[PDB]
Ligand binder design. Sequence first.
Ligand SMILES: O=c1ccn([C@@H]2O[C@H](COP(=O)(O)OP(=O)(O)O[C@H]3O[C@H](CO)[C@@H](O)[C@H](O)[C@H]3O)[C@@H](O)[C@H]2O)c(=O)[nH]1
Length: 608
Amino acid sequence: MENENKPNVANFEAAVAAKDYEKACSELLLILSQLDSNFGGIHEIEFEYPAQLQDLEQEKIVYFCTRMATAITTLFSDPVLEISDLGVQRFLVYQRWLALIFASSPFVNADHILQTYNREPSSKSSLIKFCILYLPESNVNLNLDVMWNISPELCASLCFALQSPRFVGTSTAFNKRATILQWFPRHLDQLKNLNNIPSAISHDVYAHCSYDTSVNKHDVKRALNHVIRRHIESEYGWKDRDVAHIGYRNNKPVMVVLLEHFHSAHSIYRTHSTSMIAAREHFYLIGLGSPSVDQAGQEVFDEFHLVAGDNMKQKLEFIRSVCESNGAAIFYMPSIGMDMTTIFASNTRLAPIQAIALGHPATTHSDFIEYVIVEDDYVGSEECFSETLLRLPKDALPYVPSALAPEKVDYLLRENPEVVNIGIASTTMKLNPYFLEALKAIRDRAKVKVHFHFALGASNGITHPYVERFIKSYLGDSATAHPHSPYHQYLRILHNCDMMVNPFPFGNTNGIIDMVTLGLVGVCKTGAEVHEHIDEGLFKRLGLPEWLIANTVDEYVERAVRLAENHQERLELRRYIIENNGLNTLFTGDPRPMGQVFLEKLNAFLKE
Ligand SMILES: O=c1ccn([C@@H]2O[C@H](COP(=O)(O)OP(=O)(O)O[C@H]3O[C@H](CO)[C@@H](O)[C@H](O)[C@H]3O)[C@@H](O)[C@H]2O)c(=O)[nH]1
């Protein structure tokens, strides 16, 4: 009737008390949906609160979470409650938002509701219901092999949902995802289509694997590729392109670029636009993207078109029709994994040369992509990548500064401070028990008092209270969790610090430019994967001693403790960076190599 799709806590609660299980679920699913669209934000969800919490936002958020947790408790403990296999689908996709509802509440998890399902001190619904509430923070045990027998598609639907959370830093949650990342690949490979699994969080599953510490963390991507490939053939009737003969525009071979989060106020653009603007010396560039791409982002390309269609099928047909019409010789995605469109297109053939760049630093594991554009100074092991790494010179991707960069600076070089303030520039995905245990060691081993200021991205609304407890569980009073801040307030948090540090499994790119902008020095850890190694390359590009670059976690702790302890040695490094920072080297170079290496690889092919 009216406002029948408006998320409202009182209506959810009313339907529960009234035992109208259908309205109760549908009202729950409205709220969960809103939390999804708002990335955990509780604004746009209608509720009232005691006056005391008016200006206490964290407490107002925990209040939201507790009120929802208690109503979900009443509902899901009712054995009368039945859920459609359609409800299980949607509920599982919002399971992460269910997870944050319980994790930011005093309850931590939904295990108290899970224990009511035990009638052995019963129904498919009971199981379904068990899976809906088997949250990343559950301490309940689960055999996944037993579950795969009972229901192969339901098990996959949960493994997908335990891979969807952006922040899984808790040992309890990180372990579930690490276990799933080892177990689930061989089982996902067995499915034939995406019709009975949580499709909509496929991309999450595809990208969040890169935040694990295992060497084979990317396995799950190949299996997903296969299923996607089986899906597009079977459900879309996908037929690949004749990539035998190419075509020409303005007497140059055609590069078709599929775009992903390519707005000019973003790193992706800042990091890969120069490389594509210069590839126009040898290619006609047709850009395919969303309306999110602004004019600057479209001006990269000779031609820009919006990816049209209402489903992946029509959109994949558009990308094909363009490549087919222009006989595109190169299919290029600067970023693969943020939007499903690229991931699906990665499992098709639309041009003889198909390549990605590392806008997301992870191998595709797709047979339909041959090359990976990457800078030499950022590669560790090339064996981390199914594709052939097209390693370009360290000057080959000149960056574009953001217009947000300050023009003026004040350097706080604290002579022997009583407390050493250490900055952390991290998003929730980058947080893990290994990183946090290393940070505990630094506090514990240092002969100087230290404080850790965390500037957290994606730590908003319901997300932040849960992460705050996580950080406090390791460092307590030696750590402040700042939620997401505007750039100028984010730099002020960092400005307050004496040195900085970053998560080792997945390093920082912008965080380092931020560190150096403020004349700060810090410690990173390098590794085989590019997302480990970038930090090393970027340190060297900017002029950072390699003693500040660790290979092991134990060294990471050693060198940071040293940076904290030796006040004057820290300040000499800061004064060195302040005077000879290579921040300008980041914004200069020759971006033409990429367009050249593509032409050679194409020309060789054309000749055979
Ligand atoms: O409270 C906050 C927290 C963060 N930020 C901003 O967020 C940025 C950091 O974003 P982040 O996600 O850490 O970017 P990086 O991780 O440094 O770069 C990533 O994105 C690049 C896109 O090209 C990839 O190539 C890199 O591999 C990948 O690490 C900073 O510039 C901050 O200005 C804020 O403004 N306020």
